[PDB]
Amino acid sequence: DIIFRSKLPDIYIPNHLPLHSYCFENISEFSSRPCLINGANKQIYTYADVELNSRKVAAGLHKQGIQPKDTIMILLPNSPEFVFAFIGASYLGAISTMANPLFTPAEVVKQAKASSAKIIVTQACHVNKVKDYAFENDVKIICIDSAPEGCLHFSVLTQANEHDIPEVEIQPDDVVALPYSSGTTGLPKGVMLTHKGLVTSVAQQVDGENPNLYIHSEDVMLCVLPLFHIYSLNSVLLCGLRVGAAILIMQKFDIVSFLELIQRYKVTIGPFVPPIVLAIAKSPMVDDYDLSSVRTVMSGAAPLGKELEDTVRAKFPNAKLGQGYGMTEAGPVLAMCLAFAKEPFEIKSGACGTVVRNAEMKIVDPKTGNSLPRNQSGEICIRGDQIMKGYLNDPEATARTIDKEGWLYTGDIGYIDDDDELFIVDRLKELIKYKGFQVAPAELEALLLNHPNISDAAVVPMKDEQAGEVPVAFVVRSNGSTITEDEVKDFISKQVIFYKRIKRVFFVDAIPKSPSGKILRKDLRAKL
């Protein structure tokens, strides 16, 4: 194999430490500093407050019957309670699965069943989505705001005595976070991220004499991207905690709250995606705010492009801009912008970083299986302790995704250049990404085939300025059917979260397939 590595040296990583022990390892240095700032109500929790509340919640969860290797579901927007629940479960050697609170009842229940969640932590407004399921299956519902009848209030956890945490034996390979991802084909699967994996990933980002991302205890990091995706849970929360930074929580993006919070709290680190920068570009009010405190703008999920790069340079005059690359199964971070290093490296516009330290990357020709040299595009593969343990209860999908030599096959096409900078150029896998949210076409295709008037279906991404990609469907009608485009859309829209909505339907005689019987998705993308 032709193997690529970081321009940074390998470092010592204390991957034997439980995630909480690692994240709070240097807490004595940060004890009285702001840890979580709730942007809406201006409440500040210090590092001491957050460690203590997490321990209280651990005792509370223990009292509610959570044992090692049990799972809780967090169904919350960004909030201090999200953090206390996640870290609380970690202290017990238990698992947090995280879900978008805007999921439909069917979506929430599917994930609750797949994950065997024992408790669902949510808001009162979402109780109706899970109440019947939870009652029938002895799943406790705990609300952070007010508790409807049959539910508990989150104070039942925070009122617990921190000294009532049981003795716990946590192993490095124990699962601690369970985000869902459809990976390189098929339906959403549970991604088992471990103590060892997440400690490794966080260390790869922020540890070392020359860290790949230089952040420190004086930084103020905006947490507007959702904590229910590992993207922010890892790179914002866990990384921020490790270095003693303040994490400024937003429950929901709007341009005014965003600008006000950056100015008022003097945000120094801005973890964004391109739709946030597009909102900035399209809002003249931006020129009336001071965003000079921002020293680092990190973008990922999708290419920013030259115009949005220009917006960042114009509106964040003191910010270093860089793009990075992650995938849930990879821990998630594969490549990181070396312009962010304490001793920075030069970068090129359009790059998505350099492969993380303490890891190996190779580029594999899909036609041959052979590894490729510099400047030649192929399937990006990564190997290292930071990647997932595997898919929960899915050995087949695991074996198809991570090979016997430990290589994760991402389904992404890219190349590494002469300066060890990675560029993403194409996607081999069927995945659709709407503003950074996963849309699994296999899920939509299955929902479409449920309709009596639909014979065959194929869901593919269509390029979109506002969302990056939107789902579109090529649909074959049943015999003697006059189903309309709007009828197909409305049928789907009632069942799915907003981002999975089908935006165009194209009626065709047949779906292009290989002799084996698989959708020729590249051909359909070419048509669009």
Ligand X SMILES: CC(C)(COP(=O)(O)OP(=O)(O)OC[C@H]1O[C@@H](n2cnc3c(N)ncnc32)[C@H](O)[C@@H]1OP(=O)(O)O)[C@@H](O)C(=O)NCCC(=O)NCCS
Please list every residue from 162 through 181 that binds ligand X, using CB under 6 A.
Answer: none
Please list every residue from 215 through 234 that binds ligand AMP, using CB under 6 A.
Answer: 231
Strand 269-272 and strand 360-364: the pairing is unpaired
Q: Does residue 271 have a cis bond before it (omega within 30 degrees)?
A: no
Residues 511 and 445: their CA atoms lie apart, in Å, by 12
Tell the smallest beta-carbon distance from residue 168 to ligand X (Å): 30
Please list every residue from 99 through 128 that binds ligand X, using CB under 6 A.
Answer: 102
Tell the smallest beta-carbon distance from residue 435 to ligand AMP (Å): 11
Show the site string, 350-389: x = touches ligand AMP by CB under 6 A, - = not: --x-------------------------------------
Query: Total number of residues binding ligand X (CB under 6 A)?
Result: 17
Confirm or deny that 289 is annotated as ligand binding.
Answer: no
Confirm or deny that 264 is annotated as ligand binding.
Answer: no
Neighbours of 510 (CB within 10 A): 9
Tell the smallest beta-carbon distance from residue 131 to ligand X (Å): 17
Q: Tokens 């409807």 map to which residue?
A: 148
Structure tokens at 473: 């469907």
For 463, the enclosing helix (H) or strand (E) is strand 454-464
Confirm or deny that 323 is annotated as ligand binding.
Answer: yes
Tell the smallest beta-carbon distance from residue 388 to ligand AMP (Å): 11
Strand 140-143 and strand 189-194: the pairing is unpaired
Given ligand AMP, ligand X, none, residue 303, with its beta carbon under 5 to 8 Å by kind, binds ligand AMP
Residues 431 and 469: their CA atoms lie apart, in Å, by 10
Residue nearest to ligand X (CB): 436
521 scored as a contact of ligand X (CB under 6 A):
no
Give the chain's largest Cα–Cα span. Answer: 72
Structure tokens at 70: 């049990």
Tell me which DSSP letter residue 278 carries.
H
Show the site string, 225-254: x = touches ligand X by CB under 6 A, - = not: xx--x-xx-------------------xx-
Question: 3-state DSSP call for residue 112?
Answer: helix
Q: Tokens 């979402």 map to which residue?
A: 126
Identify which of 283, 386, 270 has the alpha carbon closest to the alpha carbon of residue 333.
386
Complex with ligand X: residue 275 or 384, whichever CB lies closer = 275
Residues 159 and 64: their CA atoms lie apart, in Å, by 13
Identify which of 107, 108, 112 has the alpha carbon closest to the alpha carbon of residue 72.
112
Tell the smallest beta-carbon distance from residue 482 to ligand X (Å): 30
Confirm or deny that 281 is annotated as ligand binding.
Answer: no
Q: Does residue 461 have a cis bond before it (omega within 30 degrees)?
A: no
Is 72 in contact with 96 (CB distance < 8 Å)? yes
Complex with ligand X: residue 226 or 378, whichever CB lies closer = 226
Query: Total number of residues binding ligand AMP (CB under 6 A)?
Result: 19
Confirm or deny that 186 is annotated as ligand binding.
Answer: no
120 scored as a contact of ligand AMP (CB under 6 A):
no
325 scored as a contact of ligand AMP (CB under 6 A):
yes
Tell me which DSSP letter residue 192 carries.
E
Count of residues for the chain? Answer: 528
**Which segment (221-229, 241-249, 304-312, 514-522) binds ligand X by CB under 6 A?**
221-229
Confirm or deny that 189 is annotated as ligand binding.
Answer: yes
Tell me which DSSP letter residue 265 carries.
H
* Binding residue (CB under 6 A) for ligand AMP from 195, 427, 500, 521: 427
Q: Tokens 């649909």 map to which residue?
A: 475
Identify which of 418, 430, 404, 420 has the alpha carbon closest to the alpha carbon of residue 361.
420
Residues 390 and 473: their CA atoms lie apart, in Å, by 31
Cα–Cα–Cα angle for 22, 272, 287, rounded to 5 degrees: 135
186: amino acid identity, one letter: G
Residue nearest to ligand AMP (CB): 328
158 scored as a contact of ligand AMP (CB under 6 A):
no
Is 330 in contact with 339 (CB distance < 8 Å)? no
Is 51 in contact with 19 (CB distance < 8 Å)? no
181 scored as a contact of ligand AMP (CB under 6 A):
yes
Please list every residue from 335 through 354 that binds ligand AMP, using CB under 6 A.
Answer: 352
Confirm or deny that 527 is annotated as ligand binding.
Answer: no
* Binding residue (CB under 6 A) for ligand X from 273, 280, 321, 422: 273
Identify which of 120, 106, 174 has the alpha carbon closest to the alpha carbon of residue 148.
120
* Binding residue (CB under 6 A) for ligand AMP from 139, 243, 294, 327: 327
Q: Tokens 């290419």 map to which residue?
A: 303
Please list every residue from 385 through 444 that binds ligand X, using CB under 6 A.
Answer: 435-437
Given ligand AMP, ligand X, none, residue 412, with its beta carbon under 5 to 8 Å by kind, binds ligand AMP
Please list every residue from 480 through 509 that binds ligand X, using CB under 6 A.
Answer: 498
Complex with ligand X: residue 273 or 333, whichever CB lies closer = 273
Binding site for ligand X (CB under 6 A): 102, 224-226, 229, 231-232, 252-253, 273, 275-276, 301, 435-437, 498
Binding-site residue ranges: 181-185, 189, 231, 235, 252, 301, 323-324, 328, 336, 412, 427, 429, 433, 435-436, 438, 518
Binding-site residue ranges for ATP: 181-185, 189, 323-324, 328, 412, 427, 518
Binding site for ligand AMP (CB under 6 A): 181, 231, 300-303, 323, 325-328, 332, 352, 410, 412, 424, 427, 433, 438
Binding-site residue ranges for (E)-feruloyl-AMP: 231, 235, 301, 324, 328, 336, 412, 427, 429, 433
